[PDB]
């Protein structure tokens, strides 16, 4: 299944959807995998999250050129940490329109990230304000509340059974909630549950640091997060 392409791994999840995976050494924790998504929408490609680095992100674009060979219309990144936004410069060098939560763009410089070009804003209920996500096609963007970070966002893919929780969601066999350095411990559980409620039909849950799983990823993550309160 997996396709090794340089130092990255690509996995097809559905007819028009692939997972990208890249790795960074976290001294004291090992080589940490981070996953994002690639979606073909007709004659264009949409990306969710960069790789950890500019070089790795350029490799994602190389893989897309080889395996899909259509223009990348836009990328959306799911918060201002390196695993999700570290390759912003590579996207910009490639001429790709980039989007992030307004709060992610605000936080980007202090987090050592380059901001996206465009800011998403959200209604009180968490759904993206449609004017701020033009031409997103099947990507349905939802802010579930603060959890892994204050700015974490999530993405459903219309026409598929897939929803992407980014670093908010861990798989059903995870022992912990990972790096909580920037987490909102009080609200994490409710935010994980809100993600599930936003995408009730999604049977395949994709996330940053585990392989795709069932919705038990959501229930298990939320149940673990109940212990943070
Ligand atoms: O992260
Ligand atoms: Zn993060
Ligand atoms: Zn992460």
Author numbering: 42 to 270
Provide text from the study.
As one of the resistance determinants, metallo-β-lactamases (MBLs), including imipenemases (IMPs), Verona integron-encoded metallo-β-lactamases (VIMs), and more recent New Delhi metallo-β-lactamases (NDMs), are Zn(II)-containing enzymes that activate a nucleophilic water to cleave the β-lactam ring, conferring onto bacteria the resistance to the last resort carbapenems and all other bicyclic β-lactams that are currently used. In particular, NDM-1 is one of the most widespread and threatening MBLs that binds and hydrolyzes almost all β-lactam antibiotics with Zn(II) as a cofactor. Moreover, the active site of NDM-1 is located in a shallow groove encompassed by several loops with Zn(II) coordinating residues, which confers conformational flexibility of these residues for efficient substrate binding and catalysis turnover. Crystallographic and biophysical studies demonstrate that Bi(III) compounds irreversibly inactivate NDM-1 by a unique mechanism, with one Bi(III) replacing two zinc ions in the active site.
We first crystallized and determined the high-resolution native NDM-1 structure at 0.95 Å, the highest resolution obtained so far. No significant overall conformational changes were observed between the Bi-bound and Zn-bound NDM-1 (rmsd of 0.18 Å over all Ca), while only subtle conformational changes were observed at the active site.
